[PDB]
Amino acid sequence: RTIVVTTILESPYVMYKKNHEQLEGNERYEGYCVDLAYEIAKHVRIKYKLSIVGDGKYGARDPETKIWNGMVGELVYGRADIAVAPLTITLVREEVIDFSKPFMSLGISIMIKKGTPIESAEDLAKQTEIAYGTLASGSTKEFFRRSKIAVYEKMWSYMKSAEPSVFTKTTADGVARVRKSKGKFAFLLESTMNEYIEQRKPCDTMKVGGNLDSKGYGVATPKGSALGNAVNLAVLKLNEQGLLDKLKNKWWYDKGEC
Amino acid sequence: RTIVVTTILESPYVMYKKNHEQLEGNERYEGYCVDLAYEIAKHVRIKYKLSIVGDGKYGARDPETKIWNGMVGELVYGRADIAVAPLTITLVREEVIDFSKPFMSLGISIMIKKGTPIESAEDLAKQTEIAYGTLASGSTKEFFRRSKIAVYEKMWSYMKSAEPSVFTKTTADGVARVRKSKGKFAFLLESTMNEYIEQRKPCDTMKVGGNLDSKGYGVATPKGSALGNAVNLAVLKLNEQGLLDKLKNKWWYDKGEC
Ligand SMILES: C=C(C)[C@H]1CN[C@H](C(=O)O)[C@H]1CC(=O)O
């Protein structure tokens, strides 16, 4: 049986090769998560087909409908066998799918254009001339919506009502907005994407300060999957043999431009 | 039923309260893991008894007998329901028991007596007047035993044959040895204990340089145990509510003496 592995387009995790229309199946993708999926499949000893999540979403549960969407929905409801992506391990998700141990560690962080006079979340919260916001959905925005920490409530209260809306739909847009705002827009995103962008050629962005929390990305399987054990053990093996670190360096630093 | 929670005496995770003989049950211990276990029990609504592992070991498979010892042994042989302790998540353990997502993050690190002329693993490897070693058994030792990185092969090559033995039976042993060797002994231990010792007293040791790798502690349960799922959820919950951060500050830094 060919395992259906669901993923999502996000640099440098999963990307279309330049000639992808002249290629087929797995070959048309490249990235960190493409290499991981391959490694995982090797050690789990399985055939797999990569497939892009139909609705292009990570996974959230509808307030009223209460149905899960995205990659999480595809795992829960029988569309896919495993998800390999920058899917943040969170309580709400783990309640309905299983996550392997983290294959990558991360935290919420601040991206600014070099020269911007802010150096921490407090600096942002005590001012207004510099706008800031998160992705329009995902674990980062949820982190802010739920926080009861003084500076983060305040940042949430501000973000909610700010318009022009501070929320953007993609990482590409948050970044493009940082670069084009002449130091008037920050951008809160996962430290991993921050570090990636840092090495991208205009070299005019930078992470500032420390992370706001400590998370990880995990490989996901439907709860009770006969694959869950093998997948988790493969991730650990790949970690201990240092291959996860080599893939991070390859996609983040060897290919960096700054 | 009452749940047996196996654990081990290791500061500041599990320690005896000064007047422990005048107290009974779980009340006679304090520390980070005692707090963690309390929290996990409240949310995974269960009664529990803290049980200090009989052999005072963490968990390794005897080469000839092939029997698992220590906390891992408790779980494998069905004598404990869950293990809460500075138990490193590793592939060899995960083959036989289950781990939660990491409740703490760590790396292998160096501990010197202040004023010792070394600052990296390399500095250690390229010299001989300063002796160094690891705990007599555990994940750390294994990291060196299996490393294929030249500098670590070399350090391991040396630690194998050095005499007197450079391996210590306990953390306290390694620390007493560092303090009493006047600069001639350096201790390769987990960054977490290193950081605790440095804030402890007298105030004569420090962590130096970066970590040689990156791992975490997990709460463990018997492989395929119904309890596993809810325990892992409790850990994610405590991570998100920020209680793991609080607890770490409580036992490492709020009490700092240096
Ligand atoms: C790219 C997106 C929308 C994802 C990636 N990880 C997070 C998640 O798994 O929710 C989201 C980013 C964020 O929330 O900052």
Ligand SMILES: C=C(C)[C@H]1CN[C@H](C(=O)O)[C@H]1CC(=O)O
């Ligand atoms: C304290 C001891 C012997 C433990 C703690 N975690 C590691 C483990 O779980 O094996 C060991 C330390 C180490 O290996 O440096």
Ligand SMILES: [Zn+2]
């Ligand atoms: Zn491989």
Ligand SMILES: [Zn+2]
């Ligand atoms: Zn608007």
Ligand SMILES: [Zn+2]
């Ligand atoms: Zn609680």
Ligand SMILES: [Zn+2]
């Ligand atoms: Zn000897």
